[PDB]
Structure 1
Amino acid sequence: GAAILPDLGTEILIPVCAVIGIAFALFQWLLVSKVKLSAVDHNVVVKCAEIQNAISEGATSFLFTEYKYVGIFMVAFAILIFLFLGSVEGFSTSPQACSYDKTKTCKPALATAIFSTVSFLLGGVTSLVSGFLGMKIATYANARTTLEARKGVGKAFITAFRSGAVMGFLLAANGLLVLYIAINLFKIYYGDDWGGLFEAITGYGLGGSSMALFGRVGGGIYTKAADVGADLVGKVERNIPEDDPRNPAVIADNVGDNVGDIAGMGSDLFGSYAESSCAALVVASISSFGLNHELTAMLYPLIVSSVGILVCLLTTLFATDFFEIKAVKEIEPALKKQLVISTVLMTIGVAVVSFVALPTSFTIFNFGVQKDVKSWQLFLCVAVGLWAGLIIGFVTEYYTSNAYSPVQDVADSCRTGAATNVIFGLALGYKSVIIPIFAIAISIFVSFTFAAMYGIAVAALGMLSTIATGLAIDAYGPISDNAGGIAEMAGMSHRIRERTDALDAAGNTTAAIGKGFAIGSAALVSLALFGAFVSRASITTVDVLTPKVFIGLIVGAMLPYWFSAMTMKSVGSAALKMVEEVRRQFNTIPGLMEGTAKPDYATCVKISTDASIKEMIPPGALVMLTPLVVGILFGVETLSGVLAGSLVSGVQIAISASNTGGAWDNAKKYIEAGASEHARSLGPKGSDCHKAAVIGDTIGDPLKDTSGPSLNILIKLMAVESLVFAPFFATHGGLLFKIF
């Protein structure tokens, strides 16, 4: 049946919303351009600009290098997709009867092999763009945030947040518009075969996350090598400020924030958005919506994202125009209110969307069977994801903000040294997983019960329906991070650094939250994808108690540890090289410590560049090859266990690592800020307590910025990869069992 919203309306609505989000982005970038600076104390404006140029140059330089390799791998992998998928049917041009309706004729598998390759390259390119554009806004906004810190926290908050919003709206609108264009273009060929149309479209999410994996790991190793070395020698060893221009590793540190925390994070979340939409589309494609060619209801997930863009635009105005911050304690609650307002507004918007864009009754594909589902049930599926996210947000704030006991107790444990700081920080992280998991479990149960894999997919998308805002508050953080980096390097007033420090502490929390959303939605979408894989692979039952499934389960559960081993070791080793180099300069460059001689920043940039371009390959190989090796050698049943295991296991370590690192960082920020009697008693900077906090913070650096956040990509990537290659594994896989 039709929805109230006609098919042609939907065709207009979606791009109109994408354009509005892009226009909003441009507008905000315009208001940000009103902060003037140039390299041509006017000396402080000039100095900020030179430091900005050095960071902008370094970030653009690394991404070009990183993206070169990644782009080459993308082209190579696109060839694997075409060959493997095309080999399922012997590269035949013959049409065959539709698997979803034998009375109809469908386009040949070969075309779907071709179009899958096309959508994979689309998604890979859009992912690269997402990280790159993010880096361009951040390296533009950073020094403008620093100058605005002269007028106070509030003002600096606005430019950092407006800019964060520039990244959020661009990335969401562009991801939505590309997906919308791909669908229409593919439709010209596929016609009434919507089954094959949306099967080909799933490459979009595979391309998104493939590129994101390397972006996150690569950028992550770069930034943390620099960060750890800079901090340990400068702060623990040489008793100088954080980001002191005498430190040779500092430019690389600050390039690092843009190259990992921004560019990697942006690709990462684009991957989340693309997989969630694609997962919803495929299940819908062989459900009542796709089978009856009802465009509006078919595109229900895109309509949800369209309204999310508009909802977030409104929400943004509360932080941007309707409120002014005047005190430091207002920063975090303003960020939190962004999540609360969007959640409340999006709940109404999802209700409207479910009312106009769905028929009241319809059927959802449920493992071979059409299940009767009502529109108010679908409303609940997306709403429970959206609300699970907010919960995850509130909980993650509790565990990572220095406004609450857990982090203050972590800081407090520094009084007995580094070892107690770390014991307390590890325990906090472990503790932190409890409620997010229960929230995710509730989303799964609710959405699984109402609408099977479609419901779960749409719950994932629900959690990401407010992605423009989520990205805004997240991207706000590394921009505020660089801003204080620039303030210190430019030799600015202490009052400036105190304000940037307040913005940056809130950005640590907001970064943790962003990881909570990525992990939550990854658990959801991976389960939707897992269930779709099982159908696509003609598995009758994924039975835990068969030898093939179980070995997949326990091996899958180990993958996140193997992956974390590799990334931790990489950062550890490169940071070790970094400490040696920084020590060498402090110890052998005459006048460096006295500020009369300038250090060699390029060498530190090179150390972190060489380690990340090299060391990103094994962890990327582990994730990308696992489904292929398991699918080809052991078959689809074993891969099933691998998908379930990696999901349930990876999510625990992902969460605990991200929150542990977050807690260590803000515990240190709390000592640095000395804003209460307790904080002050752990001070001053340079005290044994502070240096113990720094030890904890630097251990947390690769935890929260390299391994931790990349884990969500491991999970969700192996799941789309498995789905896309499913026909190939089902037909030509399981070799070991076939030859024995």
Structure 2
Amino acid sequence: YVAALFFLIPLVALGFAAANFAAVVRKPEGTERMKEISSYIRSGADSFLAHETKAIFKVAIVIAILLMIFTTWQTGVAFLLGAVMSASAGIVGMKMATRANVRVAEAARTTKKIGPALKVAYQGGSVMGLSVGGFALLGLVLVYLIFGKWMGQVDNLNIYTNWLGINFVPFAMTVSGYALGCSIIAMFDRVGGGVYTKAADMAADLVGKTELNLPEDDPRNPATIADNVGDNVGDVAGLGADLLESFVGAIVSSIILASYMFPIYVQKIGENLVHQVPKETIQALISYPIFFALVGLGCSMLGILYVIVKKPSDNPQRELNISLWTSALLTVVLTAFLTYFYLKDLQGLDVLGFRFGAISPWFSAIIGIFSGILIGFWAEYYTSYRYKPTQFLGKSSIEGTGMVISNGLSLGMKSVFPPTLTLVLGILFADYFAGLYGVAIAALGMLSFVATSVSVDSYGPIADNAGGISEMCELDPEVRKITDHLDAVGNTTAAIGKGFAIGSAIFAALSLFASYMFSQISPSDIGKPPSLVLLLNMLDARVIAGALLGAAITYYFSGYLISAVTKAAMKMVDEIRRQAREKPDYNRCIEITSDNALKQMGYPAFIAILTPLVTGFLLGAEFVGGVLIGTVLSGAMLAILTANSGGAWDNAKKYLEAGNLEGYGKGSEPHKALVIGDTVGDPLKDTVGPSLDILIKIMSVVSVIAVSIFKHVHLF
């Protein structure tokens, strides 16, 4: 009864998003110039969407066929299901943004008030947020119902052996497939799309300074529009897909841990083997993350509703944070009752790591929540010019360009410590409360209100497009200032959301490492003590070698992406010169850059997906565990570094735009130094960091799936 009521929440969120979509669609359109700019934007965005979707479908079909040949067929079906859910969320969000980009500015001009434009923008972003949440949890509920309970995969819970000889718990491999689908979608989006985005931005500045002499924010400059399209591609599709991958990864990790926890804690008392953790407890913990995520999504919808109906205010950041805090607190309170009432009558929780009984995992989840917000604040502390580091960078701008670059690198390097220490304490306490299951539950709670987080993240690029459109149409300077204010708010929210995404990616990747270690269980370890099975020895030279290899592969991944951005930008500059030699060609250059980025992403994608396969069939599962540990560590550090450095450089340029630095204004030599630094930092913050967030999770997912094969089938 109540269970089915919770299972309706996904369609509730889908209908909420659809209704908000329709409501905004009804909002007034802009002037003919506004409409022409929006039409260019929409054309480029939809074209990019279709272009990437083709390759996505191809790769998804190949991977689904492979997942059906090996493992089970339900694995590939759930893979395709998750792929479809994530692709649907992204497409819906991007179409909504391309339709509301001008409506925000129309509210700002017609009403001459911040309130209405803010509410329109928040509904626009809430479309993508509710889509990312709803499609994901809907597919996951379907998986737990169709392939889960109906087919008795939650009933068997034994080591199923397929025709090839690959061993696995059926539901574990199923949820692994559902996660890998979302991961393929997110990888394509973030990696390739981001290469495109930063190619567009860079080439925009370039053609601004090329022989064509067409500065950025120029309607004639095709990259001016392409960059807007890329901004939506990134902070609406990319960031949404990343948060979806982390969310689904946390849930799937919890489910996998419980599923494999059923065969692990067994005791060969005599000739027979008793399950110390009964089936009831295993099923309860397989379902608890799903119910927790549903309650979180409901609370997120409640917060979104309050903010969209709340009396208008003057601080937009305040309203967005109000949404965040309402969702967080409601999730905390309701999930407390969920935890205590759903796990009370279970047995074996002590053997599991639950230190305070049925309520132990909730203590974990709330921790993650706070961890999340804390990490967010850190991303704001090291990037905003309201605080000391960015102020110091902007001030040192007077001392040269090399000093700007060095101080930005120093800031990025030092910025990794506060959030990483936050992660350290969060992991320690979540473990203390409820073992690795609670580590996963802390990852989940951190993302328990993912809908509002994605909505606030997607609000940013909407305001960016709004300010760009307004400036290009030369509206009233008052309206331009309104858009500037909203743009600044969106920039702050984007920094906070990117930091939150990095933290969530680290948590999810660690949860997936734990799921890998748990999935290494074989039918021959039934009598062995649990300490013998759940083990990755760091003295084994294979593990150290794998760790070094994983770190190096992460760094090489980052470097290749850096080079790819510049190559795509140079090719787009050549295309723009050709267009000048022969209303410019918007979709033409956008499709050229999109195809080049999708062709370039092939090699980083092949790295991310095949590194565990190659290294595992070559040396085994300890080596792959080492690779995962090194990848997670180096990717966490590099992502934090690049994101914070790029944000600091950009916000220091903005600091100088206001002239705060010793009266210096636009055009001064320090401003040129900061601009050079910002051109350096753009690909780091918008291409490298998110792709590392994706890497550290997708490699773990592929390892979790394929270890069932190469654990015993390895050459050396």
TM-score by length of structure 1 reads 0.86
The residue aligned with 1:610 is 595
- Give SS of 2:348's match: strand
The residue aligned with 2:540 is 546
Distance 2:390 2:487 in 1: 16
Q: Is the 8 A contact 1:261 1:705 kept in 2?
A: no
Offset from partner CA, 1:25-52 (integer Å, 9 cap, x none): 2332243234222xxxxxx622212221
The residue aligned with 1:475 is 458
Find the partner of 1:70 among 52, 56, 64: 56
Aligned AA (1:193):
N
Offset from partner CA, 1:418-455 (integer Å, 9 cap, x none): 33332222222222211111111112112223332211
Q: 1:457 to 1:410 in 2, by over 3 A?
A: same
Q: How far has the Cα of 1:688 moved from its partner?
A: 2.9
Q: Is the 8 A contact 1:258 1:478 kept in 2?
A: yes
Distance 2:278 2:597 in 1: 44
- 2:182 paired with 1:208: yes
Q: 1:552 to 1:114 in 2, by over 3 A?
A: same
Aligned AA (1:154):
G
Query: Quick check: 158-167 or 315-324, which moved more?
Result: 315-324
Pairs aligned (count)? 676
Aligned AA (1:9):
V
Distance 2:303 2:414 in 1: 32
- Residues 575-654 of structure 1 mapped to structure 2, 5 A cutoff: 575-579=569-573, 598-654=583-639
- Residues 221-236 of structure 1 mapped to structure 2, 5 A cutoff: 221-234=195-208
Distance 2:446 2:9 in 1: 19
Q: Is the 8 A contact 2:128 2:236 kept in 1?
A: no
The residue aligned with 2:98 is 139
Find the partner of 1:392 among 370, 375, 378: 375
Q: How far has the Cα of 1:318 moved from its partner?
A: 4.8
Aligned AA (1:617):
G
Distance 2:214 2:656 in 1: 16
The residue aligned with 2:144 is 183
- Residues 76-87 of structure 1 mapped to structure 2, 5 A cutoff: 76-85=62-71
- Residues 209-608 of structure 1 mapped to structure 2, 5 A cutoff: 209-234=183-208, 242-287=216-261, 291-292=279-280, 297-326=285-314, 330-359=315-344, 362-363=347-348, 374-538=357-521, 541-579=535-573, 598-608=583-593
- Give SS of 1:324's match: coil
Query: Quick check: 395-404 or 602-611, which moved more?
Result: 602-611
Query: Quick check: 337-346 or 209-218, which moved more?
Result: 337-346
- Residues 90-101 of structure 1 mapped to structure 2, 5 A cutoff: none
Q: Is the 8 A contact 1:244 1:488 kept in 2?
A: no
Distance 1:33 1:332 in 2: 24
Find the partner of 1:124 among 59, 83, 106: 83
- Give SS of 2:498's match: helix
Offset from partner CA, 1:696-724 (integer Å, 9 cap, x none): 22222211111111111100111111111
Q: 1:730 to 1:286 in 2, by over 3 A?
A: closer
- Give SS of 2:364's match: helix
Find the partner of 2:156 among 181, 193, 216: 193
Distance 2:235 2:48 in 1: 14
- Give SS of 1:670's match: helix
Distance 2:278 2:692 in 1: 33
The residue aligned with 1:682 is 664
Q: How far has the Cα of 1:499 moved from its partner?
A: 2.3
- Give SS of 2:509's match: helix
Q: How far has the Cα of 1:472 moved from its partner?
A: 0.8
- Residues 106-121 of structure 1 mapped to structure 2, 5 A cutoff: 113-121=72-80
Find the partner of 2:21 among 23, 26, 29: 29
Query: Quick check: 350-359 or 284-293, which moved more?
Result: 284-293
Q: How far has the Cα of 1:408 moved from its partner?
A: 2.6
Distance 2:211 2:493 in 1: 30
Q: How far has the Cα of 1:547 moved from its partner?
A: 0.9
Q: Is the 8 A contact 2:281 2:346 kept in 1?
A: no
Query: Quick check: 286-295 or 498-507, which moved more?
Result: 286-295
The residue aligned with 1:169 is 130
- 2:121 paired with 1:160: yes
Q: How far has the Cα of 1:373 moved from its partner?
A: 6.0
Aligned AA (1:117):
G
Distance 2:312 2:368 in 1: 31
Distance 2:34 2:8 in 1: 39
The residue aligned with 2:9 is 17
Distance 1:241 1:679 in 2: 25
Q: How far has the Cα of 1:156 moved from its partner?
A: 2.1
The residue aligned with 1:88 is none
Stretches of structure 2 that go unaligned for 5 or more consecutive residues are: 158-168, 263-276, 522-532
Stretches of structure 1 that go unaligned for 5 or more consecutive residues are: 1-7, 38-43, 86-112, 590-597
The residue aligned with 2:530 is none
Aligned AA (1:438):
L
Q: Is the 8 A contact 2:353 2:433 kept in 1?
A: no
Q: 1:337 to 1:472 in 2, by over 3 A?
A: same
Query: Quick check: 566-575 or 397-406, which moved more?
Result: 397-406
- Give SS of 2:474's match: coil
Q: How far has the Cα of 1:294 moved from its partner?
A: 7.2
The residue aligned with 1:691 is 672
Q: 1:663 to 1:465 in 2, by over 3 A?
A: same
- Give SS of 1:544's match: coil
Q: 1:17 to 1:497 in 2, by over 3 A?
A: same
Distance 1:413 1:579 in 2: 32
Q: 1:291 to 1:407 in 2, by over 3 A?
A: same
Distance 1:290 1:635 in 2: 32
Q: Is the 8 A contact 1:119 1:201 kept in 2?
A: yes
Q: Is the 8 A contact 1:51 1:486 kept in 2?
A: yes
- 2:31 paired with 1:45: yes
Q: How far has the Cα of 1:293 moved from its partner?
A: 6.7
Q: How far has the Cα of 1:507 moved from its partner?
A: 2.2
Q: How far has the Cα of 1:297 moved from its partner?
A: 5.0
Q: Is the 8 A contact 2:51 2:591 kept in 1?
A: no
Q: How far has the Cα of 1:237 moved from its partner?
A: 9.0
Aligned AA (2:138):
L
- 2:716 paired with 1:719: no
Query: Quick check: 623-632 or 242-251, which moved more?
Result: 242-251
Over the aligned positions, Cα root-mean-square deviation in angstroms equals: 2.5
Identity of aligned residues (%): 42
